[PDB]
Design a binder for this molecule. Structure first.
Ligand SMILES: Nc1ncnc2c1ncn2[C@@H]1O[C@H](CSCC[C@H](N)C(=O)O)[C@@H](O)[C@H]1O
Ligand SMILES: [Zn+2]
Length: 148
């Protein structure tokens, strides 16, 4: 199946597939409510695509207001700011042994960051991906110990 078809009803279906709960990794995380097949589109990392140079002053503003800052690093040039116009995907935690991965897809000329299942994921599992001095708490044995 091509990407555009799989993307069309993702907002409707995501509500049924995932939810936000307390995480043993950190704070809140994203968990699945039903088994998810390998290769399945899980959820869009919703938000505003911005040039990376802008993030430090945004984060500074958010912090000064007590607004929780949420951002997805695409690469060294671009970030998705999910602070004001994000969705449940902004709670996805990092793992040193993740079960999802991110991809930037193109829909009618526009960029969307979507999260895909790396393997079959079972009901109840936390969903995690590999983020692109803070220690890591993914709990994996093959763990890199750090976010940096
Ligand atoms: N594996 C991990 N170990 C420690 N902290 C993590 C982590 N994965 C995510 N985090 C924390 O979560 C932030 C990403 S936002 C992810 C949702 C977050 N747990 C929350 O409740 O707000 C990271 O900056 C880090 O502070
Ligand atoms: Zn870790």
């Amino acid at each position: 199946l091509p990407m555009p078809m799989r993307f069309r009803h993702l907002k409707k279906t995501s509500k049924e597939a995932v939810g936000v709960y307390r995480s043993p990794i950190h704070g809140r995380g994203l968990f699945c409510k039903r088994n998810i097949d390998a290769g399945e589109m899980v959820i869009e990392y919703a938000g505003i695509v911005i040039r990376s140079i802008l993030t430090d002053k945004r984060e500074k503003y958010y912090d000064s207001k007590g607004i929780g800052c949420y951002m997805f690093r695409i690469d060294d040039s671009e970030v998705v700011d999910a602070t004001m116009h994000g969705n449940a995907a902004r709670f996805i935690n990092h793992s040193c042994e993740p079960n999802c991965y991110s991809r930037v897809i193109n829909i009618d000329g526009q960029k969307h960051i979507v999260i895909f299942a790396m393997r079959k994921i079972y009901r109840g599992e936390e969903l995690t991906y590999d983020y692109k001095k803070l220690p890591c708490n993914c709990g994996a044995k093959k763990c890199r110990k750090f976010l940096n």
